[PDB]
Structure formats: structure tokens, C-alpha cells
Design goal:
- It is classed as hydrolase inhibitor.
- Keywords: Serpin, coagulation, haemostasis, thrombin inhibitor, activated protein C inhibitor, acrosin inhibitor, serine protease inhibitor, HYDROLASE inhibitor.
- It forms a trimeric assembly.
- The entry is titled "Crystal Structure of human native protein C inhibitor".
- 3 copies of one chain form a homotrimer.
- Chain A has 354 residues and is α+β, with helices and mostly antiparallel strands.
- Chain A has 2 domains: 1-160 and 256-309, Antithrombin, Chain I, domain 2; 161-255 and 315-354, Alpha-1-antitrypsin, domain 1 (Roll), CATH 2.30.39.10.
- Helices cover 26% and strands 35% of the residues of chain A.
- Chain A has 8 helices and 16 strands.
- In chain A, the strands form 3 sheets. In chain A, strands 1, 6, 7, 8, 9, 10, 14, 15 and 16 form a 9-stranded mixed β-sheet that branches.
- In chain A, helix 5 (95-105) links the parallel strand 2 and strand 3.
Amino acid sequence: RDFTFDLYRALASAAPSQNIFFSPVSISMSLAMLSLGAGSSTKMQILEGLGLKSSEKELHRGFQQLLQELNQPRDGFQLSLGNALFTDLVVDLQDTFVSAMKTLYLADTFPTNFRDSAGAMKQINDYVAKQTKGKIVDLLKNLDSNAVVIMVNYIFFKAKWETSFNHKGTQEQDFYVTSETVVRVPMMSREDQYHYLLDRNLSCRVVGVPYQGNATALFILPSEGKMQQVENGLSEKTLRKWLKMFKKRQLELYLPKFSIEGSYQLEKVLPSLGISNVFTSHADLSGISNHSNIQVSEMVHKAVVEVDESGTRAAAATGTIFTFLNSQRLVFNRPFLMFIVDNNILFLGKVNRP
Amino acid sequence: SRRDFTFDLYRALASAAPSQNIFFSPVSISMSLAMLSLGAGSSTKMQILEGLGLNLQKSSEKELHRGFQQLLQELNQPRDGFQLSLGNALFTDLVVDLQDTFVSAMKTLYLADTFPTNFRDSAGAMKQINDYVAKQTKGKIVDLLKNLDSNAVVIMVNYIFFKAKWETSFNHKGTQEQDFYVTSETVVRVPMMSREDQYHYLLDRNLSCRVVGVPYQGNATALFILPSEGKMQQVENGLSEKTLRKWLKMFKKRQLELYLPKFSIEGSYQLEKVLPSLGISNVFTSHADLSGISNHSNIQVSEMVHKAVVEVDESGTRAAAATGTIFTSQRLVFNRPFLMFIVDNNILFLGKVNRP
Amino acid sequence: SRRDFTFDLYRALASAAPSQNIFFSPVSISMSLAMLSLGAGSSTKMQILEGLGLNLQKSSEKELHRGFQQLLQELNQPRDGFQLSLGNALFTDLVVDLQDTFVSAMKTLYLADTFPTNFRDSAGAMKQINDYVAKQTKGKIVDLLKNLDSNAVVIMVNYIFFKAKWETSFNHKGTQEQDFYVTSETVVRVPMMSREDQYHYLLDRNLSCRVVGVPYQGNATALFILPSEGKMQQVENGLSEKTLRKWLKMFKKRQLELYLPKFSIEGSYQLEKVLPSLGISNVFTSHADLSGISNHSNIQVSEMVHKAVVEVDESGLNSQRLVFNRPFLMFIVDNNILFLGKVNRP
């Protein structure tokens, strides 16, 4: 039972041969926020799902602390997170719950006339459009006239690498989406020391590329035909191992310049992972409203990330070395997994097609 | 009478929407039109240039465009606490092929883009247009279009929003809720700002209105016009560039107790429905000569949408200088419908505030 | 409903690869199977014949094979514009003794070769198979197989491709990049061709899709199917030969502004993984009866590989506008359904 990774597999299984990209920490946060107004067996699943009792008072203080940091402009690594709840006109909001939202999670709660589907969707999309300064302007594509409460979570990310990729080393190359399907993509490159590691167990190679700061981008390349195998091995433990075997190594790195995003209706997947009550009529959200017919109708999550050459410090030119074969080369030209960690797993995804 | 683009447009717009606020950017709208004339010909182009009141006698078309290009650059020119943000974009139906000359000129001389668009799918075209402006304005304007006809061939969009700090803030504790007489029968409550200071002032006995100038941090200045009781129509009919130039010469400093409402205003217009009455019609019809943008025989501007937004609050660069700090005034309170001008060489904005 | 090889196979292949492009040749595959039935016996042979939906009630096996053989001779008839290249070959392990009645019929009536192969040497066998297809296809398909098990007993390979130009070309001057909506969330940029003209058109309110025919420089015609928003699955479920006959009936000319992505597409399938679901299974298991090819104990088709390839581009009055910028279906017909496919992403 490893929520983050069970969520990944659940998503990859529901959408074979497609990119996958979500924010683990961000989703758990949304789920914690939600527990703040859930009761009995409903709050139980959420907490059990997250991986957590009673000391929950600290659970929220932790996230609150985390939010303030992220939303703190730390130039060269600016993360943009957002949460918001839209509740139908008939669900009366508890001031204790609304205040908690604003205070702990900096999230607003907006009454909404869900009987007016087109209007409600525009309101939700306009809100996120303003909040994200125009970066995400069409979060929702459809909306049901029977919605009671819609939860939205969005997160945009783009930091500068510690060191830029070669200013002239980006060339178009082949990327094998499959043994049959082949596409051209802009391929960045830079030779240097890198936290490398080979996992003969899961059969894959892992390389770490440092962002300007404390976050690290982890790129996993499964060996021929072993993506499924690696996916099944993904786990908190496995991750702790990798960070423990990482040793700097001279490396001719080849990595695609790409943009990836993911948008999911979490209510369609979380149930299969144990968090089901809250999404059903049997839900207990009495902490939000003592209205009987309350339940999360949709929990939409969207994460977006862009990877390019831009680094803080220009790349150091090798030059003619004189020592006692050929440096190790690693080109990401087959589907690969991507992690972005900074104490937490900020992001997790699969680049099936740049 | 005489032709005066800006004020004639103001009057056209106000006449079409009585009892309502009116707000637009004269300079932005005329820039959009000049840009358009770049791919227009014969009477279509001329209708535009003359309609704009350009001095063709004195300057070549080339010098005029250079004028606008230079002006555009200065506006997008980043200025401390005087950030002006305007944009232009042209959306053309799939079937119209564009002259690379026009598209390029547009992009490099007017910083305006052009986007092929499938107008047969109106909902999709409207979303594509609104999403585009949303991103360009960083979320400031997200729903520029509310409707869209499926017969469109080309739609032009022009938007601008501005917010600059006053040269001097209003009293930190001087904002109180007050009555505002929309009419003599209707009264609303609005946040009223205040500050006693030396202001450029002037009383116009001809049009019958008081005009006060409030400087922005920079070169721009806001002009507020308070018509005498029952004289709004009279002042509206009197507006003209002559009147404005005169007002600027006659201005005289004066100690004043100024009460000005805090407010936000905006205006969105389908200029294709008004400009024709001002002499600019060909371009909006099937007999339009837009051979410079496309050889396509049916090309015509179906819609030209303009949106301008402005916010007025207490914020200024420096703080108000407390009066009577050692001890040793006429009061002007804008609590009735008033006119507003924002000037910086050009008339950046012009509007009427009926209800703050 | 009622058995339908062509479309039951399509659904079979679609369901196995959600969100991916599908592209195969129904005529080519039914041919390979008929050919294989020539060396099959009892239930193994009957599963194939019944699987192909053949009418065993009115015709004899002899007549059925004659029909197929005649059809093959036609498909292979030269003719500038709509050139079609078809190929079939069987590779049998060294130990599987071959009945010359089978080998000879296979070669003379179906133009197919049978090659003894040392499947104990995987790399060798795979190279010989790929080398062969590469030569047979004139360099069109040079790497048919990517892997091969040393336990293989018999590998069957079928390939097909064509060279044709549209009757009425698409103008390059009308090709511009556009937004293709893979999903209502995923959108990509693709090179769209366009051309206003009169085209066979039809609107199927039943399946809820629009169909347009685009004639090739010959006798063949491309069929492009566009499901209405969110109706792809619905259209897939309703596809059938009868339904196709219906479209060729209801087809009426119409002025249209057609926007069609320019794309190339090919498909490769391990038919042994899917045909069983359609009732054709014994031939791929140890319980196979292929006494017609050999009276050797452990004979069975280990892999039945199929590859079909195609390219779609210009070459090699306010009329209704129809733009293919959502996942669409593609047919290539000419007396027979030569190619069937689904473009999920150009």
C-alpha cells in the first residue's frame, strides 16, 4: 500500500500508451484539506489513504507550512499551486470549515449555482484563469447539472536547472515511442558529473539533474521492454534506495526538451484505491455543511511542467583531456519516468511521447 | 458641424447606450484602425485614414505609420508605476489566404498577430479567441467575447487596461462612504476619496463645468469634468479636441478640497456597429477593398471588438502632505455623473462615469 | 450480433491498443488464413473457415480456394495508379517435414513460399525472415520482426502496401498547421491538407458520424469517417460489412471544404494474440491439426505476423466545411476492403 505509487499505476493503467503527469504532494494536500470537513468512515478512508490519528492537528500545520514556502517567490524555481471548492447554492457552509480552508490551505470556497452548468463551468474556468495568470484557462471541459461540490487543484512548475544544457548541443533526434512508432524530438545534451545509478533489479537506469535550489529531477530509463516492470517496482522504498546509491559519474547525457501535463478526474480513480465514501451519496462531509445531500461530485487535478535548456549558470566546456575508452552515454530516446523531488515528491510522471 | 474622430465616437457610443458608463481608448482604437488600413485599398483605406482625422496633407502614409509604430513602442515601454498593457490580434477564417507582406508588417510594425480560425465552429472560434486574450493579458480579460456569429470571416480584437499610481496618494484615512447622485431621483453609496491640495483647475462658463487635473506618476494626467447640474448633455455636445486644448491652456493651480470616488470602469464595444456612422463603412462590408491582406473576394471585417479597463483608487507614489501641520479652500466633490480623460500627449482614455 | 470477421477483428485490435492508431488489411489477412487452412485438418481447419465467415453451405472448399486464388491474381494485377504489393511466406523449423502437395499448392495457387528454418538459432532465423521480406518488398519493410523465440515451430508472415495518388490532388499551397484534438484534453499540431470540391458524402444519424469518399488515381477510394463529438466508441461498435454496404448505397455527392491531416500510418500485429478471441484458436496451440502440411507431432503456428503500410498526402459559394481534427476512421475500398484503420493521432 503506497498511495502515491498506487495512484500512478492506477492512472497509467487507465490510460495506456499516454503521458502521465501529476503532483503527489499536491493531491495528498487536497485530500487533507478535504478531511478537514469529513467525518466517521469518510474521514477514515482519506487519512488511511494518505498514510496517516489524532495528531492530525499537526498534519495540517505541516501542509500549511509547506504552502507558505512554495507560494514564497524563490526565483529560479517558482512553483504555482492552487486549490478551490465550489459548492452548490443549497449547501450551507460552516464558518469553521471555510476559515480553516483560507487559513491553513489558502483556499477559497465559492457558492455556485450548479443547476446552471454552462454558467458554473465558466465561473470555475475564469477563476483558475485569473489565479494562474492566464496559464490554465480551460480546466474544465464539461460539468454535470447535478454537481454538488467540485474540487479543483492546479499546479504549474518551471525552474532553472543548476547548470544549463549546452547552448549549441540541442539537435533533433529519433524517439522510439515504441519499437514501431518513431518520432522526431529536440534533444538536449551536456557532459558532466551526474548522480547516476543502475538498478539491475528493476532493470533501469536513473540519473539526477539538479534544479536551481534543493529540488532534483530524477529521470528513469527502463531497459528495452521493461517499463511495466519498472512501473510495478515504483515505491517509497525503491525511491529511498535510489537516493542512497546515487554517485556522481562522468556522463554524456541526452535528454528531450519537452512540456508535459496531466488533468484527471480523481473521483474516477481514488475509489479503487480505498477513498470511495466521500465521492458517494453515503459520504459524510458534515464538517463542511450539515446538509444531507453533500458529496464531492468531482475532484479535478491538473499539473503542468516544462523542461528546456535554461539553467542558472552556463555549461562548462570540457576541453581536451589528457588521462589514462569513452565516457558513459545515456540518451532518453524511449519512454521514461520523471520525478521532481524537494523533500517531497513534488511531481511524478511518464514521458511516453515528448 | 466639424469632423472630430474621438469626440464624435464618444457621442456615438454614449447615444447608443444612455444612462450608462462609457469607457474606451481613443488612441488604441485609432491605432487598430491605422493598422487595418495597412492591408486596405482605394476608398476603403482612405475612408479610414480620413475618418481618423489624419493630416494626409502634411505627412505621407509611411510617416503616419511610423508615427503609430513609435507611439506603440512608447506605450509598451515599461514605466515604474505606470504600466499600460494593450494588444491587437486578427482572426481570419480558414478560407482566407493572407499576404505575407501584411502579416509581417502587422507583426513587426504593430506587434499584432494573425490567427487562422475556423469560424464555421463558432463556439470553438470564440473559445480560441477568448483563451488567447486571457493568456496575453495574464488573466485580466478572460471573456472578451460572449457571443459569436458563425458567418464571420475576420474578427479584430483590441484590448487595453491601465493602472498607475497617482503622483500623490489620497488621504490614508480620507476615504468615506458617500452619496452619489446618479440622477436627481436615484442615489447610491460609493467610497469617496479625498485630499486637499494644489490642483490644476478651471471653470468653463461656455460648456458650464468644472475641470480638475490629477497627475499620475509620470507624464500622464487624469482630467475630471463635473458638469453643472443638468448640464451633462451640454458638455457632451461641447467635447472636442479644440475644447480640450483650450482647457489645457487655461488650467490654473488652485487649493482644493477634492472628493473623488474610488471606482473601476470598463467598456466593451462592437465598433463595426458604430464606426460606419462616422464615415468608416466599406471595410465592414462585402464591397470592402482588403486586397492587401487577402485576394479572397469576400474578405471584410465582420466584427471589431474593443475593450478598455481602468481602476481608480487612492494609491500614489508619495504620501499626501498633511495640511496645516503648522496651520495656515474651495471644495469640489464628484458626486454626480462625470467625464474622465487620461492624457499623455494623446488621449489614452475617455469615459463617462454615470454610476461608480 | 452476427459474426463478422473484418469488423470483429478491428474491434479486437482496437480494444487491445486503446488510444493508439490501428491499421491493417482485412483482405490480406483473410487470404493468409485461407491459405493456412489449406494445410489444416478437422476442427483446426473448421475454426478458420467458420472464422472467416465463409459460406460453406453453398460452396465447396475447392470453390472457396478457387475464389481466393482468383482474387489474389486480381489484387496483384499491374496498373499505374493504385499499385498493390502483397506477400505471404511460411517459415518452418528444420524438423517439420513438409508435404509437397501443400508446399506446391501454397506456391502455385497462393504465390506463397515455404522455407525450412533453424529456429534453434533465433538471431539467424529472424535475420533470414527480415532479409526475405526486405527483398520481397523492395526495401519497403526491412525490419518486420524485432524479436523471435528459439522455441518457434512455424512462423507465418503477411505483408502489404500500396502506391497510389489521389484522382484529384490536394494543393500544397493549401496545407497549413492546425489543432488536432486527440482528446478533449490533449491537442497537438498537424499539417492539414485542404481542398474544396464535390465529394461523395453521407451523414449517418444512426451511428452518428460523417463519411466522405476521396477517390484514388484508379479504381480504389479512400473513406474517411468522422464520429460526432464523443461518439467514436459508438461508431466502432456499429461498424460492419452490411453497414459499409449501406454507406456505399446512401452516398451522395456534395460541395465540401475538406480539411484532412497529412499522415503516414502502418500497423504490425501478432495475430496469434488476437485471432483466438474470434474463435480461431486451435491452430495456434499444441492441439493444432496441421496434418496437411506435415504429419509431425508438435506442429502449430507459433506466430502469425501482419504488417500493412500506407501514406496519405498530396501525392505518393460557402460549401459545407468538414475538418478532420478529432480521431477518425479510414477505409480503402475497391471491390474489397483493402485497408481498415483508425487515426487517433496523425
